[model samples]
Target chain A: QTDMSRKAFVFPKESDTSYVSLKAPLTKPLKAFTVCLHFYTELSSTRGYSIFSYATKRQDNEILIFWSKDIGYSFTVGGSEILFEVPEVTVAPVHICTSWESASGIVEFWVDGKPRVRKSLKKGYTVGAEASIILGQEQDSFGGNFEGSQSLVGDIGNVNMWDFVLSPDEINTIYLGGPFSPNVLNWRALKYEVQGEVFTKPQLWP
Target chain B: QTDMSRKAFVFPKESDTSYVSLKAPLTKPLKAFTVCLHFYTELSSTRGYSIFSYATKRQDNEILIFWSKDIGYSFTVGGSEILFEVPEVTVAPVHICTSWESASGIVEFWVDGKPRVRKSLKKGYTVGAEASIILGQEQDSFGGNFEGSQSLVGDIGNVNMWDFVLSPDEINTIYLGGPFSPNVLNWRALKYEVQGEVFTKPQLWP
Candidate 1:
């Protein structure tokens, strides 16, 4: 029998009006934090697709994650784009984890549990407190403007957030299907709201 | 904060191309059985919308459920249409339950935990075994030939089945959000497969 115990939230690939919103702001420390989620997409759009975001009081202070299917994954912090390009993984679900440390001004991006990119961002910046976290659309402002061309179309699962960086071994174990207890966002016991026309269902990965 | 912890499967209200297929045959006794599910819809169509079905080896030996926006709810046993009509519910989500007893050939249908209809059909018949159960699309023959006009468009959740008639209290409790351990089908720990573009997500309700 097909096993559908594990599931993902599905968004219409071509929809400009679909998204998932969290009612509460994400809880993370000012200096350090991690953002991790499993994303699967069959869309090969050359344009950018917004995967996740946290809307701060100011647009530049917001945190955002995006993937240009033609390019690779990129994120913004404190209004500056910190981007890196690599070959896209089109065959399967991609496990991604990105982190930032204010003290070191370092941003670490891990794909499929392997460290892929490490870049320096705002050196002394702190992520704003009490920001609205969202999935599927980038926050051009504080919870108001959303662009249709920049929406995500696919399955997202196992979303987690932490206040500190995880050990390399911990990351590898997570990639190998080990248990991960999240501090900020836990997909197994999620607390959020649905907007527009998005759907969440169980998924069985290959 | 918005609570998105409760989830359900969403079906496009007007799609000729959506359905969910169960991998295993539901466990139902030869003499009696019950089918219950929570359904939510804002659609009021003049045409028919099939919500659930069990395709057996023989055509007339199948079980089916449907709703006509104008005509309320209806079902069939052994290919015979046993139906009833009430005032249409223009509300968002509606909970429905249906059951059959071979010894008395009594069929009971419930809406929102209240007994709505009682009838008799196929007194000496036994529901076929090894049937293919499906949602969103109705089976015209034994398992094939689905029509778009007869497809369901909305949300379905908390589906449960039993091999025997549920006690009045048991039915009421299930309607009141009480514990129900299904022997045939359990939506809480669903074990099924998606055939088309059908999507399942978390839902919150009373």
Candidate 2:
């Protein structure tokens, strides 16, 4: 529900960033989830990299929200065996929250959102129903061995994700974007909010 | 032998001049000759070119001498009908002289060494026996059409030819370095003065 003019997006030009990428008209596969992230950064170099992928194809099997000054606040699972662990360096701009539940896996992590690292994933993550969604980078093959420096520079607004996992005062009332909202009459100018089964069909791209 | 330490061979680098060449270890052919050249200034809108070849892949006859400013002087005669003919252009380094004999095609043209276009022999120009001689610029496929200020600013040396047309005291003892007054030794230094019939028969590199 937290909306900053319904989230603005568009960043192209760092010499057009050479290999730009985007594809996320929509995708859903976190059996039951929570994904609240608001980003900002100014990285100078520890090696320069960035990845917030949930993969099915940039070399399949994924979940990597990365930052690696040789291992600093990390996240990676199923990306060929490497599961959730936690550390904290938070030098400023922090608000990354993650939660997943398909029978339990990565049950919590909230930095500025508070929680920290709740763990409980004995192994169960199938989420591959309609996956096309992709943001920047991870164009394919993430083992070109890039680490250090990290990239996710400045500006990323209140983005919400939830198949259920609302507590914390309903996620701060959906991060303050309501009139004491329980669901929404104006949850950020709601275009359509019908929850469950809506499979609009036609989605298959590798 | 009138050798005041070799008088002329200057080539003061206009990128060291070179035209039709094939004098490195050849065996025979060209005991007959030809030369017709002319080149005008104003670089004629830059169409530099140059060619002096005696090409002979065993049977495919070739002999060309060229320099151009949009057709100032040209003469071609390669085989298989890429045959060219544009005779007559006086004033030049045009001193074609040849005579020699017994390779086939007996005595043809021999100027300065005297004989000027005689013509005979039904066959006989199986040069070098196999082929391996290149002078400069011109790596096969002689179709002719070098555009751009007809290159060549100087240096062609006392080139002579003969197997049998040398009389005026062997054209005043030609001049360069020879087995007989003034260099006319072809057949690639005549196989290092005949490697004693392949060291009389040995083996290695078979």
Candidate 3:
């Protein structure tokens, strides 16, 4: 998930009105937590939001980390851009940056040392106690309102999360992909990742 | 069972003395009944007794009937010589006679169309209320007891009982196995033939 060269595999674009977020409302109270997202999207620095981030509440005005497939993932502040078109769905050979983003804002994107988008939205926003995390679609209002319709028919793999974001070096180790580094924080925890497809051969620990 | 020709099968007989009576201290009680019997000795006329006619009472030395099997059956003085020996255990084959003698000096025995014995015991015996009219064995106790070890094991059929003894012509009709007789009867009764088969055919009533 720390590889910066890896691309976003699923996200929203300006031309199309679909976005996949990892949050749904929870039925019960909860503690604040972090997440690592793997998806495909274009970069839009001018967009008014980050791809997704924690917030105490949900409404369109609540804090978010939004990424545009055409416009790069950006805060209302500053981040660099990659000139790429907002993606059009097609049966075509598509190779782009694929990576994992952290809820702790210690961003890691790329299979190796390269970074996709890394910056922090300033604090005062945290996940609410009663928010259900989701696999696809952003949840801002009533339970099923997704920002866009970006459903990942393809597979996702090697997703991991931790209470604390790892340093960029730890992200580098996870991106190395193998049994070499054990005890890396919460390795290989995706909702569903196929066999032989996770970045590292996952290790179970005591 | 009305087939007289099918009545030759005898039950097992042993050293244990047995004979049926319409009045008695019998081992089992029964209603009015009839039975065909065979004897093995020549009862001498000296006994002042004819065989096959007896309603023997243990308290009083009175026997109502004693029609003899030898000499075809007849009434004679007491001490009359008749044949009675150790009976065989096998099924007997014979055109036997069945009749009853009354205490009213009435003696009766009939085989086929002939009255073989007649004349009572001079005093008509009242059938005891608890009398068991046994078929193959004389139960000498009031409730019906099989005295000694002997018992009848062969088939028995054509069991009939009449309130009145038949004359020679009536006996002949029974010998013909017809004239539609009805008395104490086992209707559509189970097998009492040599092969132990039942009569299942329906009979028309006139």
Candidate 4:
């Protein structure tokens, strides 16, 4: 991918095998991290779909975020999960950012830069290496075994990942529209492979 | 209107003559106030539309909120206005709660229970009575003078109003899905009169 920062991956249909595999170099596991992305969808069916997924040999849900149209979220980290409610999904693209620290197991979730109820995840546990980072489909195995019922049929863009838990000010700036430099994944020059079916398109409301 | 609280006023098409006039008995001018509502619109044209309009004989925009598809808001109060940007509108219903105090001119705007950058309004100014409150059309006069280009074509519900600056906790609770009783206007038993081409129907994503 050549500078996908301004583009969004439009998943036209739901399929178990369809996904975008993110590639990033990580020598050691992460103790703290933050991730931000924009996703637009009109496919709010009763079935759950994966917004983000990370699977390792040790844990299929090393890091996972699932959305159900009926209720809300089941965000997982290192296989531990927290069920919570979020703003309703619609055609409008929603900006989501999450920060977590292993020391206190503090998890902060923000939608469109505004903080929501805080939760906790795996404490004193580092994320595993060689984890498969994916979009569109939730993984039940290490990089494989995706469920069609949990496939995303929408658009995702501006995916930024940081090894350190982003500060409040940093998250605010990003939410108000700023391109931040990150060591883990720089969205402007992100490296990712497209598999199955997906198309790069100009942002609808960028 | 028969218990229109559970239903949203759906405007199927844009027109200058269409609106829903709210009837509330107010004896005196308000010193401080807060207004909350849910609006759904897919009409993001360059033309601006009115989400809420309060027109007094002294000021057509006594307390008005206008949305522009482009670089955003020009919310008016007692003929005074503030330009700010809000979240992008889509097919999804968006909750908006605003609290304004008369003493310090402080203004708090929240979207779906999350607060954003605060703003200011007319200081120490009491809103005049005999005001016209309407949805779907911006009033250029005390009650009428609607423009088709600046008309809203969507759904609006859960309209709540209070005569005092709602406490932080109260606003938070309202944002989290509790209907608070207020003397200004209670959405549950709201008394409103429908004008041209407006229909009270079940909320699409209520």
lDDT string, candidate 1, B1-206, tens digits: 11212556667435655777764445543578888887755444456778788888676227888886677777788888877686745444678778888899889998877896589988988886678788878887655688888777666777777878887788898888777787777665667767665554434234
lDDT per residue (tens digit) for residues A1-206 in model 3: 33322223232233222433333324432222333434332222223233343333443323233445445332321121222122333332222222222222222233223333222232223333443333334444534444433323232223344433344344555445423222212323222222211232222210
Tell me the lDDT of candidate 3.
0.33
Q: Each model's TM-score?
A: 0.50, 0.18, 0.29, 0.51
lDDT of 4 by residue, A59-149 (tens): 9998887786676767789888887785565435688888888998998888877887878778898987677889988888877898898
Better of 1 and 3 by DockQ: 1
Greater TM-score among 1 and 2 belongs to: 1
- Could you arrange the candidates by TM-score from highest to lowest? 4, 1, 3, 2
Model 2: residue B64 alpha-carbon error in angstroms = 40
Please state the Cα-based DockQ of model 3 relative to the true two-chain complex: 0.00
Individual DockQ of the candidates?
0.01, 0.01, 0.00, 0.02
Per residue, candidate 3 scores C-alpha lDDT tens digits across B63-93 of: 2223232222333212232222222222122
The best candidate by lDDT is 4
The weakest ten consecutive residues by lDDT in model 4 chain A span A197-206
Report the lDDT tens digits of candidate 2 across residue range A14-96.
11131222233244555665556554442412333353555554344355566555455455545533323434343233466
**Two-way TM-score contest, 1 vs 3, winner:** 1
lDDT of 2 at B118: 23
**Per-model RMSD to reference:** 18.1, 29.5, 42.6, 17.0
